[PDB]
């Protein structure tokens, strides 16, 4: 197949393999290496000698999980060797890292004797914080893990053994709550005796199922006690008292079919004879025991789940292990025990019922999902999985006493969990915590924010995520029923209760058209034009804000930047000495840089540049950071006629206005951001410690700079945001994504709170 | 100590540990993971099943080396455990990666029985391409490696056993060539019986030393045959027929002292009694058997070497293992054998004699080094090490038959080796190969290039590296003896034979001042001013170029950009329709982007922007790449009055001039570089596949853009370079580093060849 060859080149091209190792600390100099190695590395070693625990503080143990296998059960290809099994392992590690931020070593072992293999593995224990076995044959595997969990004082976990059980377990919980079943009256039939089969029962049972109501099958029919044909010590756990000997006889009147075998194993004939509301987990690969459509054909009352990505309810293990190993690892647990595996099932099934975020609908091509028969388990790609599962896993490991380190700030824990991908995401979270902070100080009151484009798909979808973060109270504009149509159209019930206002219909409408009239009658407006402009949701919004009928507004999700910025300016205006200006954030590992003005003024004058900068400094001072400002130029201090003079004189004005602040010009870009270049070449410069605020000499330089950093800099950039207006106001771009719309709203809310506080004085 | 605590926070802060694992292939989408894992990963596995060899083609084996230890000998702290020994290992891996680009897993093993440990290690063989043991006690270690090298069909190597031997071995070779000794008449005394001692002899001997002339000591004196006090099976290798029982009796008349013990072990008394020209390797840590100054005190004829970084001849293993494992790994060798270890000693000692590059002098604070008594071995930080050692290691492994894959293009091999750090470095190497390519087609003739600032430290030092790459024939300007003074002052004898010209003294001087006269008498020059301006090296250079007395020039390593660009323009001029323009390269993983004009024109007109671009396209077409051009703006196609109109009309002109080329405007930045944004929003745009040539609307935008990418983009940027002049000419900045000066010269040479070729037509 072309797909086969595409896989081959994926692995082969460029750097062969799928993994690489890098340093987590600087490693450039005589000094850097004199820290990471001799003579420096002695200091941690000695400290680990005196207290072994500290091995987690100075080393990578705390995040290092080994994926180990002998390649005696790779995927569905079986015992194909340790060599051929390696890529699958590299990949399993990739999954670890991408889904829970966990670093992983692939270890391919050449021993098929249970004892060689264990004697080899157990002695790796100081290396890893946790051990993930994968793709090892039955029944050897059971002997190996059962032994190892006992042997080693770190967690040991065979993913193929327990994953399927945990996800299909959460799934069963849900289906059972759905169909009003009780676990203790559920009959469960397991066809198949692979790695997974044995643990499925352990778990359903652990969730409350009666083992008498559980029948288990293999390639030779029902497993009845005393059957000797093809048994091992481990299958012997779940033999039934039943007289049924064929699968079919077992599935007669059965409530749930746990299908762990091959396709076609489940006939429409057996389906006709299962209980009312049959729960069917057909997880055979690549093809299920029966297709969902063929099953809905025999019994429309059937609930169906597979491991395939193109059918509903994809049962993929990745819902499981990453979140789990994570939670374990963070508490420095000694095991992954049953308390924990169950806590994980309970978390997955709990998360499943929450309204499906538009980020997730997005991952799967806009398809809407609601908790039900077609959504039993969170989609494998929910970014919330980790946030919901890992903390409960740690919570369990602490409650069960296998943990050696206690997590106290739960919220903090989750925060770090989000933080895992996104140096920007962390920033917006700081931001939101800081909205909540002065929110709760002024009565828990939330800033009122109007969204003129009330039928905007993107604005709505953003709002959705917005409310459960309790950022703002949303007011949309348009015809109330033509927007509730779009809320019901987007399956977004999160926000069924928000204010929806038609301009022309609102009581203060006329009071408004009069107030616009006097503000603009001598600027080209008669009494008629003000009536018709106030009918524009934008002008209606702004006027709402100016009068205090709302604390802020945001639009421009549908309109050109300009077209959307003008009514704001004509209604709200700027405060004394203000200038309208667009500002960006560039987010690095430590600091962030502020870029302006990137949307508004075409070729700003010196006075104007000094004001842009001063505002940018009030904004950075808001976050408790010392603002450092550079008026950018093509020259290093020339004062030459033209741009340099404008910028030099600009900085001079800015200092004239705020003498406590470090401000300079004119200077090139690199000369700005880098304090080393500054001290080496222009030691006279008042700017040291590198600039954190970059003012551009004109619009060409700033728009090209910000969009070029965004595309090439591979550092993350948010914005642009609007500044300098009398009231909390902000313009989006049409190209704005939903994320953009929600953080933009956050800033709007904050500045609003800041407006209220400037009022209090 | 404050240093101890600084080490602690180095390891503890941010992400605990010192290592992380990432993916080497994209991993973002349903598609990305459907390749790296199921169902895709089946395709490599099946392929490895049919031919095991292919495990190197689709997996990370080919670059994966395990550093393994039980922590029974960590540094000088001894048997402190597998746990405490981990950080030292993480660090050893860091070294692997940083010095030879080798990925490394740290494996800390809890077994002190030779047999547990080996039985555990050998079964890891499918995982790694090679095995590095480190810091394991004697004599267990000998049993373990001696066993393992036999056991496993991948290389096994205990670094502490052989490193010291290999580096101190190259070092001995040199000292022996220096003092005109022959190995077979050398007497060698080894004090100490650590890991290293045993292999030292193996190697000196393998280099030609007679074992009868070798005496070996430990904590109980000389090792004589039959002494039973404190022996093991392995010390028994090198017992001597000698009657000396104390160290002192051994060192009487000894030629070389191999000191592997503790400080003070070597008295001035014993020193008085060693042979003429005593070679002293005192490598005890942290303090040597004797300080170099205390040793030079007793015997000034003594050659001395330590493992300390602040004394000459630092013997650090890093000269050894990285280069070695590299060369092995690339040939898919089954061992690291003696043929190879020796080939490595021969490479290190050969490299030691090459003139010391200014990059290396730079690493150590400008100190100059020449092969001699104070430089026996390349400095640990020579970037050449790898380039010289690894290919010879592979060469040996192929000649000795332990290899399973043959390297043919040796040059290519080295090229890739350089390439290892530097996506820009690879580019300049392409460039140089391409200078050599049309050089060898026009008679091996090299472009003549004049360097007016002939006393420039940086220009000289650059030239040094330049010649051995045979790029150009350098002509310097200044007073001949005042520059040969600076060549002798910089210990840079590489270039003792280059043309050195005083302007005023040269025969064509007057012919020149006359030709300047008529070119500029009606532009403010009398006959006198031309005499005195031609006395300026710059004008002298340019005039040399204009007349064909040289093929090109470069300066501005000392002068302001402008001040240095003016004489060029006044003498050489531009060709028909030319515009003077500064251009940069941005280097990514695949493509590169071209930025202009970043130094010259302040606010270029439309006609001018179209010409800047056209030139930039001749330049990108030169490298066989399809040029894609965007006239950058703050707008997406507004044609609005102002910048957008200028740029839109600009592109329109550029197409009017070269209709085969993909050129567009006006457009924002991101809209340019990203073909996806282009197809989604402006599908009408003639520009698809993302822009690779970015023309700026003015100087503010371009200087701020390029210097901002350089500082934040963390993609690499070279330049600025000069374009559009009639002849090969180029201006440096004062801030230019030596690297900058040498690649700048390369381009100058090339354009010169391109000038010659345009002439041929």
Residue numbers in the entry:
A (entry chain A), B (entry chain A): 16 to 776
List sentences from the manuscript.
Despite the limited resolution of this dataset, the electron density is readily interpretable, with good refinement statistics. The structure was not solvable using the MaeBbound full-length model, necessitating the use of isolated MaeBME and MaeBPTA search models, which results from large conformational differences between MaeBbound and MaeBapo. Loss of acetyl-CoA causes a dramatic change to the ME:PTA domain relationship, mediated via a remodelling of the L1:L2 helix interaction. Thus, the MaeBapo structure reveals a requirement for L1:L2 complementarity, with hydrophobic contacts at the interhelical turn (A434:V441) and polar contacts along the helical faces (R444 and N448 to D426/E430/E433). Dyndom analysis reveals that the apo to bound transition is represented by a 69° relative rotation of the ME dimer, with a 3.4 Å translation that pulls the ME dimer away from the PTA regulatory hub. Resulting from this large-scale rotation, the ME hook subdomain is freed from the clash with L2 observed in MaeBbound, and is now located under PTA d1 where it is able to adopt a helical conformation identical to that determined for the isolated ME domain structure.
Bacterial hybrid malic enzymes (MaeB grouping, multidomain) catalyse the transformation of malate to pyruvate, and are a major contributor to cellular reducing power and carbon flux. The larger ME isoforms (hybrid enzymes) are predicted to be a fusion of two unrelated enzymes; a catalytic N-terminal ME subunit and a C-terminal phosphotransacetylase (PTA) domain. The PTA domain is homologous to PTA enzymes (that interconvert acetyl-CoA and phosphate to CoA and acetyl phosphate), yet they appear to lack critical catalytic residues and thus acts as a sensor instead.
